[PDB]
């Protein structure tokens, strides 16, 4: 990556445009449950998980790792940090909305 890898013990992860990672179905199902979908009983909602699992970050945000190796997300614009991907809250609300729609 860049010549420095960490700033103040925090590793800042940078993704290239041509970088490619295809997650596993097991990971998609786990993310589905974490945003509130039952994958077995609610296949009609699973498109939200298949989109959300690889949701891009806004440019203000990077994935980071602390001195223990734990992943978090950092907003360089305002200095806020969070364990979740900043879009996960919105995917959880979309799941609720879409479950209602199909009912």
């Amino acid at each position, epitope marked *: *990556a860049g010549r420095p*890898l960490r700033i103040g013990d925090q590793l800042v992860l940078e993704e290239d445009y041509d970088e490619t990672y295809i997650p596993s179905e097991q990971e998609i199902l786990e993310f589905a449950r974490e945003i509130g979908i039952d994958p077995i009983k609610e296949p009609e909602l699973m498109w939200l998980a298949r989109e959300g699992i690889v949701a891009p970050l806004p440019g203000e945000w990077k994935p980071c790792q602390d001195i223990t190796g734990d992943i978090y997300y950092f907003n360089f614009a305002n200095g806020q940090s969070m364990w979740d991907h900043p879009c996960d809250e919105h995917y959880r609300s979309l799941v609720i909305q879409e479950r209602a729609k199909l009912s």
Partner: nanobody, 117 residues
């Protein structure tokens, strides 16, 4: 899926060397890799980072003694450890991260290192 598998630990005399290794599936190509260690009474702590293009970073306590490296496919991480000291005793862990918007972080199972005398 990634299934990180570590090796190379055990008991060693002070002043000796080890070469820890961690290997993943061939279809893995990691953005970032690193070794960590959890010493008695201490939480898990960085040892060394390496990026996909080979740049490294070390904890100050090991920089002049350890060498982290990866392979050409970026799915294996190695830690050469020279001039081992009793304070290097810890459970070592390898970490590997892929990124696709979200970060996907994987860990090996833990590698006991005990330096005696």
């Amino acid at each position: 899926q990634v299934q990180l598998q570590e090796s190379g630990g055990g008991l060693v005399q002070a002043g000796g060397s080890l070469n820890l290794s961690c290997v993943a599936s061939g279809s893995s190509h990691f953005n970032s890799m690193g070794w960590y260690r959890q010493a008695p009474g201490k939480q898990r702590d960085l040892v060394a980072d390496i990026s996909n293009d080979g740049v490294t970073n070390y904890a100050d306590s090991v920089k002049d003694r350890f060498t982290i490296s990866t392979n050409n496919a970026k799915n294996a991480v190695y830690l050469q450890m020279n001039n081992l000291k009793p304070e290097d005793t810890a459970v070592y862990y390898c970490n590997a991260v892929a990124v696709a918007g979200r970060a996907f972080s994987y860990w090996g199972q833990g590698t006991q290192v005990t330096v005696s005398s």
